[PDB]
Design an enzyme around this catalytic site. Structure first.
Site, PDB file in Angstrom:
ATOM      1  N   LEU A  13       0.818  -1.216   0.000  1.00  0.00           N
ATOM      2  CA  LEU A  13       0.000   0.000   0.000  1.00  0.00           C
ATOM      3  C   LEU A  13       0.855   1.271   0.000  1.00  0.00           C
ATOM      4  CD1 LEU A  13      -2.724  -0.952   2.739  1.00  0.00           C
ATOM      5  CD2 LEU A  13      -3.079  -1.141   0.275  1.00  0.00           C
ATOM      6  N   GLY A  14       2.132   1.152   0.366  1.00  0.00           N
ATOM      7  CA  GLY A  14       3.073   2.261   0.268  1.00  0.00           C
ATOM      8  C   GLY A  14       4.297   2.137   1.153  1.00  0.00           C
ATOM      9  N   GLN A  17       9.808   6.007   5.593  1.00  0.00           N
ATOM     10  CA  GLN A  17      11.245   6.247   5.869  1.00  0.00           C
ATOM     11  C   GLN A  17      11.937   5.075   6.598  1.00  0.00           C
ATOM     12  OE1 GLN A  17      12.281   9.360   8.715  1.00  0.00           O
ATOM     13  NE2 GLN A  17      14.060  10.026   7.492  1.00  0.00           N
ATOM     14  N   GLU A  20       7.065   0.289   5.813  1.00  0.00           N
ATOM     15  CA  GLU A  20       6.380  -0.127   4.602  1.00  0.00           C
ATOM     16  C   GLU A  20       5.005  -0.710   5.007  1.00  0.00           C
ATOM     17  OE1 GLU A  20       7.584  -3.944   2.023  1.00  0.00           O
ATOM     18  OE2 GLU A  20       9.045  -2.300   1.827  1.00  0.00           O
ATOM     19  N   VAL A  21       3.922  -0.313   4.320  1.00  0.00           N
ATOM     20  CA  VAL A  21       2.565  -0.776   4.661  1.00  0.00           C
ATOM     21  C   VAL A  21       1.963  -1.755   3.630  1.00  0.00           C
ATOM     22  CG1 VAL A  21       0.189  -0.144   5.361  1.00  0.00           C
ATOM     23  CG2 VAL A  21       2.074   1.279   6.130  1.00  0.00           C
ATOM     24  N   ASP A 133       2.288  17.555  11.447  1.00  0.00           N
ATOM     25  CA  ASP A 133       2.075  17.331  10.016  1.00  0.00           C
ATOM     26  C   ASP A 133       0.602  17.033   9.656  1.00  0.00           C
ATOM     27  OD1 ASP A 133       2.624  17.196   7.260  1.00  0.00           O
ATOM     28  OD2 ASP A 133       3.595  15.259   7.346  1.00  0.00           O
ATOM     29  N   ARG A 137      -3.522  14.418   3.304  1.00  0.00           N
ATOM     30  CA  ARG A 137      -2.662  13.247   3.010  1.00  0.00           C
ATOM     31  C   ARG A 137      -2.438  12.344   4.239  1.00  0.00           C
ATOM     32  NH1 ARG A 137       0.562  17.822   2.875  1.00  0.00           N
ATOM     33  NH2 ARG A 137       2.019  17.857   4.637  1.00  0.00           N
ATOM     34  N   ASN A 138      -2.559  12.929   5.431  1.00  0.00           N
ATOM     35  CA  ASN A 138      -2.362  12.196   6.684  1.00  0.00           C
ATOM     36  C   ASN A 138      -3.651  11.766   7.391  1.00  0.00           C
ATOM     37  OD1 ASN A 138       0.476  11.813   6.852  1.00  0.00           O
ATOM     38  ND2 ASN A 138       0.735  13.991   7.379  1.00  0.00           N
ATOM     39  N   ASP A 151      -0.293   9.640  11.033  1.00  0.00           N
ATOM     40  CA  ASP A 151       0.943  10.311  10.625  1.00  0.00           C
ATOM     41  C   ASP A 151       1.820   9.332   9.840  1.00  0.00           C
ATOM     42  OD1 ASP A 151       2.889  12.315  10.314  1.00  0.00           O
ATOM     43  OD2 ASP A 151       3.582  12.136  12.392  1.00  0.00           O
TER      44      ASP A 151
HETATM   45  O1  4VC Z   1      -0.048   7.002  11.932  1.00  0.00           O
HETATM   46  C1  4VC Z   1       1.035   6.621  12.379  1.00  0.00           C
HETATM   47  N1  4VC Z   1       1.775   5.657  11.787  1.00  0.00           N
HETATM   48  C2  4VC Z   1       1.457   5.091  10.483  1.00  0.00           C
HETATM   49  C3  4VC Z   1       0.975   3.663  10.549  1.00  0.00           C
HETATM   50  C4  4VC Z   1       1.181   2.882  11.676  1.00  0.00           C
HETATM   51  C5  4VC Z   1       0.721   1.586  11.683  1.00  0.00           C
HETATM   52  C6  4VC Z   1       0.068   1.093  10.579  1.00  0.00           C
HETATM   53  N2  4VC Z   1      -0.141   1.829   9.483  1.00  0.00           N
HETATM   54  C7  4VC Z   1       0.307   3.091   9.478  1.00  0.00           C
HETATM   55  N3  4VC Z   1       1.598   7.140  13.524  1.00  0.00           N
HETATM   56  C8  4VC Z   1       1.180   8.246  14.305  1.00  0.00           C
HETATM   57  C9  4VC Z   1      -0.148   8.646  14.415  1.00  0.00           C
HETATM   58  C10 4VC Z   1      -0.490   9.736  15.198  1.00  0.00           C
HETATM   59  C11 4VC Z   1       0.486  10.437  15.875  1.00  0.00           C
HETATM   60  C12 4VC Z   1       1.810  10.053  15.777  1.00  0.00           C
HETATM   61  C13 4VC Z   1       2.154   8.965  14.996  1.00  0.00           C
HETATM   62 CL1  4VC Z   1       3.827   8.512  14.896  1.00  0.00          CL
END
Ligand code: 4VC
Length: 278
Positions: A13-14, A17, A20-21, A133, A137-138, A151
């Protein structure tokens, strides 16, 4: 708690850094989950970052915030399991819709979407958690038009143009950033409020344009200096064609020069869930 062998990987799915999802199936018919794993070239630094993200995410328990369903920090390989959000990120979702005349989306629905974000942010505020952020997109869309704030590391990759990159510096979403963040790097709840205004603008644009899209990165940074100088030469995002004047004025309040004059998320939520209905 939670056994890895039960995961059947379906599609990528993407890519972020340190992560990977993938969409996965669970066998106990078939439940779909989103699973974040380390990238193949992951280092020790990436592993550490992954472990910290588990810690951060374990704290976050709200209907309009991404939920951690399960984990592997036990024995490797590391993973985070979350809800599969069938409709993708909010930016993709809105871009695939047009505003109803008179696949479509109504103006009351745009408000409902924005109210859910505000409620998510209200939750984060109470925790003194600064997001840093916030943008469409988030945000994730589940339907029945359920919005969850996340995020993503991967946001930096599929939306590269939304971030200002200088070698040796943090990667900065300058078009969503409050003037004092651009000039000082002071991120607060008040700068989340400013980014919420920009996010709301995006929702009302149906994600059709980048904020200050006709302006360069440098002009955006220069614009923050104009807020600082406060000689009435600052420039603002224009009113979206779908946006009524009263709603636009809410956005403008998010962009007050003084942090304290920006509305708290409790008030933003109240406006979007009730006052905006008239
Ligand atoms: O959304 C976040 N991680 C992406 C993710 C994680 C697990 C599965 N798929 C995506 N983190 C996150 C959310 C809100 C505040 C801070 C963070 Cl670091």
């Amino acid at each position: 708690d939670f056994p890895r062998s039960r995961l059947r990987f379906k599609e990528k799915l993407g890519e972020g850094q340190f992560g990977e999802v993938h969409l996965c199936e669970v066998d106990s018919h078939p439940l779909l989950v989103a699973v974040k794993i380390l990238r193949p070239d992951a280092t020790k630094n990436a592993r550490n970052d992954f472990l910290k993200e588990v810690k951060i995410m374990s704290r976050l328990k709200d209907p309009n915030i991404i939920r951690l369903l399960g984990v592997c920090v036990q024995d490797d390989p590391l993973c985070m399991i979350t809800d599969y959000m069938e409709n993708g990120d909010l930016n993709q979702f809105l871009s695939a819709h047009q505003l109803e005349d008179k696949p479509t989306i109504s103006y009351p629905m745009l408000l409902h979407v924005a109210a859910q974000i505000a409620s998510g942010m209200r939750y984060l505020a109470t925790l003194n958690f600064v997001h840093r952020d916030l943008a469409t997109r988030n945000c994730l869309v589940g339907e029945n038009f359920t919005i969850k704030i996340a995020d993503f590391g991967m946001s930096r990759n599929l939306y590269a143009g939304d971030y200002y990159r200088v070698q040796g510096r943090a990667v900065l979403p300058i078009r969503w950033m409050a003037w004092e963040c651009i000039l000082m790097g002071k991120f607060t709840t008040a700068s989340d409020v400013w980014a919420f205004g920009v996010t709301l603008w995006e929702v009302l644009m149906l994600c059709r344009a980048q904020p200050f899209g006709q302006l360069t990165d440098e002009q955006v940074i220069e614009n923050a200096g104009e807020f600082f100088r406060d000689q009435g030469r600052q420039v603002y995002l224009s009113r979206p064609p779908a946006c009524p004047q009263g709603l636009y004025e809410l956005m403008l309040r998010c962009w007050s020069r003084e942090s304290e004059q920006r509305p708290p998320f409790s008030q933003l939520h109240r406006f979007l869930a009730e006052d905006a209905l008239n």
